[PDB]
Design a protein around this nucleic acid. Structure first.
Ligand SMILES: Cc1ccnc2c1NC(=O)c1cccnc1N2C1CC1
Lengths: 412, 555
RNA sequence: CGGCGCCCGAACAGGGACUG
DNA sequence: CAGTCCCTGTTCGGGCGCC
């Protein structure tokens, strides 16, 4: 018996009508035992054909966890409430969160299950638990409490959260606390022992305030940026100068003071690719002036709050992957590289899945926003397994690309 | 007062809308006098009512015909009401595949009578039902009425039926965990691993539970009928098969004959292994009229032949045994056609199938295999909810070379090698580094957009040149064309420098087949070489023999 | 009248390169 | 800077197969 903040699908658009994708029996079982238990708790309840709305659901285990977590893909719903949450209630994003020697992510989403949900909105949380082989029809529910992974859920719980936290925040003013969807980011410059202790302490806070919390540590102060770099060479084959000049031409799409002119003249005749050509000095100086123009920061790159972030991922081989975050071509807010992730040397889709998750995480720690991915993968491939390797409680936005590599040379 | 059978569904209306009013459109004259009476029948059973003032609602009649009936069936058209009624989440999500069924000792089928008329319509929506249709010809102006149950051709009839039915069966199911029911339309199929009599026990005890809600199940019902006939399937508790397929032997071949033919072949392909539709699918390419005349080629007939011999002997699928692993083994059938079998105990198949689909302008066998494996995983999840172990005609080294080199993210799940030629191979590899002491060809091609005219040629470190004039071409084709030249005129090892990003993209993805004859030729030359290193440089940067080439070709 | 499987033909996104 | 083309690559409306 408490109020309910009415919520509306922003103007003109209807509830999500999206199809449930086939699930593995493993996951269908886990969902069945979770929803039947959640029905008993009156968190959710059964629905009829009079509700023509659907959101997809599946299940995951978080990293190093043997427990099945239910996960709803609320992206379409999240878009029409997108306007609800974005225009009505804001969360100021700490620019300092990124500077902490440590940042832990605690999953507080369970708390959202306290609060009731506006009775008029509930028909939009509709989800089907599918059946193997279409043997039964689907088991359909809708949400009674604040549904996990919806953006309205952390929005509406904002007040209550700031409350439950205010003792700790007040007692510990120097610790930074951010909240992104079902996750709460807590970070500090404390030496790691006492950090982990302050995290246990916060766990206690929400534990005694009526919350449960099913490592999470990050190290943002150590996050490195991948600069573009031209090789250091003794002797240059024709082929070396060629790869150099072409790479240099791309880089000059990013950094305009680059000139290929004298190195180009270096390539002048028709010479064997493997012939060793000495570097004229005028070109040698053009090249050195280039390595220089390549250690500076790119003019006019700054984050703009209104624009969406875009992340591009390239597969570099032998377990390495490079990425770039940007809002406008050639102006990159960040570039980076990953290697020896889980799946390295055996499963590309696993590795990429991992990559998309680490990129999203830094994107949230840095701008408090998830990027839109350009994924180097076939559509169908990705849809099939990505559902298998996902350890995150959120789901970025993505589209699929084919780019035979001339941009691959974000790496040696 | 009428009476109240089973829980009702809250059907609403599309906001800001109200019931329809329409004029009649023609329907055959003899049978419709019958419904005037039939309507009075329903009055007494509870399926109809009427009021004079209260209905601003009227609906017409338009129909579709069905074969095989020994008595006539009445009908009404709500199509205007339909368009005006709320949408539902549809209950028929598609059908189970026979190969996905677990083997059941005992399997029966109860057929529900008065199925649609056994379901209460939403109280308040009842109002919207009113309709009118011609007596025999006509005499007096008429009268009208409303529906108290699920009306024919209405959207909620199927959705709400299915759901209500489900709700009823639920307590029976919960009180009977080891029975197994499946609902298709108005038929229920029940099965158990229990003994034959306790099985018929629960069959009546369930006709009880269905009756308690008013659902009538007669005894023309058959335990002595299985195989059950369902959607082209024949189903025995132990084994399933497709219903018998008739392949036309007709001497006269129209493209529509080949069409029906193909459709029959694919449907056969779920069970009879090794079906090839390729050449038959080739006939269908780009035809204006469905009535056109087409002859059968020797290939299409040799295919039709091998297929006729596959269909000759009969065959049956087994069912799934959850205790045992699933196995999917794929064999390359050539001409970018693939077949796979999914079984558990060796030589006993759950099902078979083809993957023939040619994806992309230029492709290769590894890619196509990867695709089939993906298709198959999907099919396996829908049906058995798990991924099979895969048996594939590809060396673990072949594959490792491919997936690890390719620029895209790519994967096959847990799988092992099967030496079952043809084995899938990569027919050439490009070098990762320039080849010492190989001639180096700088290549170019160019064409003029207006005249559609151009030339393709090259220059080398050895002094060797060539320029070939070409007619009716494009910029891309000339750049391919130049690479082709460098291949033909070069020795067993060669470095080729191209400034065509396009051509480089194609060759670098190592195609073994192409729609494009020129690419096919490039491929053939590529396969003949010992070492080929292919490189890219930017145009008009004044590079190398490319500035020199550029002048000669661009001239 | 309707879903699914497939084949066939048309409209939009990415990229290249030319017209001063 | 607009406006032309040439390639490649998914989405949507047209007939068979199964109800
Ligand atoms: C057509 C059909 C569709 C779905 N399931 C069944 C059936 N009917 C069967 O013939 C059947 C046969 C064998 C095992 N299960 C069957 N059953 C399941 C009920 C035990």
């Amino acid at each position: 018996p408490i109020e309910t903040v009415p919520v509306k699908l922003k103007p003109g658009m209807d509830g999500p009508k999206v199809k449930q994708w086939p699930l593995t029996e493993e996951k269908i079982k886990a969902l069945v035992e979770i929803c039947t238990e959640m029905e008993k708790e009156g968190k959710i309840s059964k629905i009829g054909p009079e509700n023509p709305y659907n959101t997809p659901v599946f299940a995951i285990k978080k990293k190093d966890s043997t427990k099945w977590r239910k996960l709803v893909d609320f992206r379409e719903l999240n878009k029409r409430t997108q306007d609800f949450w974005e225009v009505q209630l804001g969360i100021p994003h700490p620019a300092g969160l990124k500077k902490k020697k440590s940042v832990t992510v605690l999953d507080v989403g369970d708390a959202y299950f306290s609060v009731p949900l506006d009775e008029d909105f509930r028909k939009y949380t509709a989800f089907t638990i599918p059946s193997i082989n279409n043997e039964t029809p689907g088991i359909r529910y809708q949400y009674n409490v604040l549904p996990q992974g919806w953006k309205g859920s952390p929005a509406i719980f904002q007040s209550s959260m700031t409350k439950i936290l205010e003792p700790f925040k007040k007692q510990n003013p120097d610790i930074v606390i951010y909240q992104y969807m079902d996750d709460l980011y807590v970070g500090s410059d404390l030496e790691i022992g006492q950090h982990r202790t302050k995290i246990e302490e916060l766990r206690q806070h929400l534990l005694r305030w009526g919350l449960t919390t099913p490592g999470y540590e990050l190290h943002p102060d150590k996050w490195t940026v991948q600069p573009i770099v031209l090789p250091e060479k003794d002797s240059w084959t024709v082929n070396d100068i060629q790869k150099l000049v072409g790479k240099l031409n791309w880089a000059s799409q990013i950094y305009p003071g680059i000139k290929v002119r004298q190195l180009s003249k270096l390539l002048r005749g028709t010479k064997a690719l493997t012939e060793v050509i000495p570097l004229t000095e005028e070109a040698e100086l053009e090249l050195a002036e280039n390595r220089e123009i390549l250690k500076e920061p790119v003019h006019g790159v700054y984050y703009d709050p209104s624009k969406d972030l875009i992340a591009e991922i390239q597969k570099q081989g032998q377990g390495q992957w490079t990425y770039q975050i940007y809002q406008e071509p050639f102006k990159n807010l960040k570039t980076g590289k990953y290697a020896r992730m889980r799946g390295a040397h055996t499963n590309d889709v696993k590795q990429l899945t991992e990559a998309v998750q680490k990129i999203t995480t830094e994107s949230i720690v840095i701008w408090g926003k998830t990027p839109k991915f350009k994924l180097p993968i076939q559509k169908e491939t990705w849809e099939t397994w990505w559902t298998e390797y996902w350890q995150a409680t959120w789901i970025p936005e993505w589209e699929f690309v084919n780019t035979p590599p001339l941009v691959k040379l974000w790496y040696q | 007062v009428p009476i109240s059978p089973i829980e009702t569904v809250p059907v609403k209306l599309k906001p800001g809308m109200d019931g329809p009013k329409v004029k009649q459109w023609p329907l055959t004259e003899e049978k419709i006098k019958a419904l005037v009476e039939i309507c009075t029948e329903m009055e007494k059973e509870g399926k109809i009512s009427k009021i004079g003032p209260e209905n601003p609602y009227n609906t017409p009649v338009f129909a579709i015909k069905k074969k095989d009936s020994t008595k006539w069936r009445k009908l009404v058209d709500f199509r205007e009401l339909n368009k005006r009624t709320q949408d539902f989440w549809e209950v028929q999500l598609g059908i189970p595949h026979p190969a996905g069924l677990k083997k059941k000792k005992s399997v029966t089928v109860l057929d529900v009578g008065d199925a649609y008329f056994s379901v209460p319509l939403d109280e308040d929506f009842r109002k919207y039902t009113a309709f009118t249709i011609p007596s025999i010809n006509n005499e007096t102006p008429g009268i009208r009425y409303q529906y108290n149950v699920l009306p024919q051709g209405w959207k909620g009839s199927p959705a709400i039926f299915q759901s209500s039915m489900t709700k009823i069966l639920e307590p029976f199911k919960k009180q009977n965990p080891d029975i197994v029911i499946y609902q298709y339309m108005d038929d229920l199929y029940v099965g158990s691993d229990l003994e034959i009599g306790q099985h018929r026990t629960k069959i009546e005890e369930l006709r009880q539970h269905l009756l308690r809600w008013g659902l009538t199940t007669p005894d023309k019902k058959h335990q002595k009928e299985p195989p059950f006939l369902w959607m082209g399937y024949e189903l025995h508790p132990d084994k399933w098969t497709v219903q018998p397929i008739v392949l036309p032997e007709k001497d006269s071949w129209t493209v529509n004959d080949i069409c029906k033919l193909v459709g029959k072949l694919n449907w056969a392909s779920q069970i009879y292994p090794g079906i090839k539709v390729r050449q038959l699918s080739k006939l269908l390419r780009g035809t204006k009229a469905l009535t056109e005349v087409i002859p059968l080629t020797e290939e299409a007939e040799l295919e039709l032949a091998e297929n006729r011999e596959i269909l000759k002997e009969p065959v049956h699928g087994v069912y799934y045994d959850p205790s045992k692993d699933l196995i999917a083994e794929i064999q390359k059938q050539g001409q970018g056609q693939w077949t796979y079998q999914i079984y558990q105990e060796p030589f006993k198949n759950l099902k078979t199938g083809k993957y023939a689909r040619m994806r992309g302008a230029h492709t290769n066998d590894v890619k196509q295999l990867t695709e089939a494996v993906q298709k198959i995983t999907t099919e396996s999840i829908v049906i058995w909810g798990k991924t099979p172990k895969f048996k594939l005609p590809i060396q673990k080294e072949t594959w490792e070379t491919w997936w690890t080199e390719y620029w895209q993210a790519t994967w096959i799940p847990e799988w092992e090698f099967v030496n079952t030629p043809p084995l899938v191979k990569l027919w050439y590899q490009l070098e990762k580094e320039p080849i010492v002491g190989a001639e180096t060809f700088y290549v170019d091609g160019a064409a003029n957009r207006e005249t559609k005219l151009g030339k393709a040629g090259y220059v080398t470190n050895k002094g060797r040149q060539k320029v070939v004039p070409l007619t009716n071409t494009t910029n891309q084709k000339t750049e391919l064309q130049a690479i082709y030249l460098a291949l033909q005129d070069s020795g067993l090892e060669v470095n080729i420098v191209t400034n065509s990003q396009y051509a480089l993209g194609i060759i670098q993805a190592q195609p073994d087949k192409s729609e494009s004859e020129l690419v096919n030729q490039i491929i053939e030359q590529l396969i003949k070489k010992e070492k080929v290193y292919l490189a890219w440089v930017p145009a008009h940067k004044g590079i190398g023999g490319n500035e020199q080439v550029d002048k000669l070709v661009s001239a």
